[PDB]
């Protein structure tokens, strides 16, 4: 009944090199989303940025063509039930450019 995880995370447009992802926001009040991505192997470090909680999309750039990436989004949200902010559990996907 409480929604703190985004749902339906997907790549909606793509270059070989860049991605437009959207997700569906959860119920709760999100102050920002955290976006994380990196090569599914483990071969390169992992990159991370945030998006304002008002936004339910993000772009990802400078990826390598033809490589499998793992993309992850989680909400930093206000848990009204406890009285502090919380880093929500993430939703994740794989995508090959």
């Amino acid at each position: 009944s409480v929604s703190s995880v985004p749902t339906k995370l997907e790549v909606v447009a793509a270059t070989p090199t860049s991605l437009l992802i959207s997700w569906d926001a959860p119920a709760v009040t999100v102050i920002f989303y955290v976006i994380t991505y990196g090569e599914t192997g483990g071969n390169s470090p992992v990159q991370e940025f945030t998006v304002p909680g008002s936004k339910s999309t993000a772009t990802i750039s400078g990826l390598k063509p033809g490589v499998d990436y793992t993309i992850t989004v989680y909400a930093t949200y206000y848990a009204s039930n406890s009285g502090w902010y919380e880093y929500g559990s993430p939703i994740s996907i794989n995508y090959r450019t």
Binding site: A27, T29, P52, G53, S80, N81, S82, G83
Partner: protein, 125 residues
């Protein structure tokens, strides 16, 4: 004034525990205007209005009880810091319409309740 200290502590503890129960059990139900936080502020308005009016009619009531009910119970039950954060968070989330609604409903709500509490006892005498 240790007798007074005990009144603020016993009353405040009761207030804070009530806030806690109501806030945890209900705030998730509607997170744009958490119902638990709203209800404690509304209820503490109701309580304090009726108590204030009642104390005007009982001018020999020990300040111990008055202290327990106002500074302790109602003061521990109601919350500004929680309300402010909720609103702040909605600002952070860019949700301006509910940020605004939340302050209207908390301030105007609590005034209506304090007045209703005070006047339903004033009409009763």
């Amino acid at each position: 004034m240790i007798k007074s200290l005990f009144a603020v502590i016993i009353g405040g503890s009761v207030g804070c525990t009530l806030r806690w129960l109501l806030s945890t059990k209900f705030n998730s139900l509607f997170p744009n205007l958490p119902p638990g936080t709203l209800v404690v502020n509304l209820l503490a308005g109701l309580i304090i209005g009726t108590a204030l009016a009642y104390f005007l009619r009982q001018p020999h009531l020990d300040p111990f009880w008055k202290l327990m009910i106002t500074t302790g119970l109602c003061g521990g039950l109601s919350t500004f810091s929680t309300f402010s954060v909720e609103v702040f968070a909605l600002l952070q989330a860019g949700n301006y319409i509910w940020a605004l609604t939340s302050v209207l409903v908390h301030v105007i709500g609590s005034l209506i309740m304090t007045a209703l509490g005070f006047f339903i006892i004033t009409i009763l005498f």
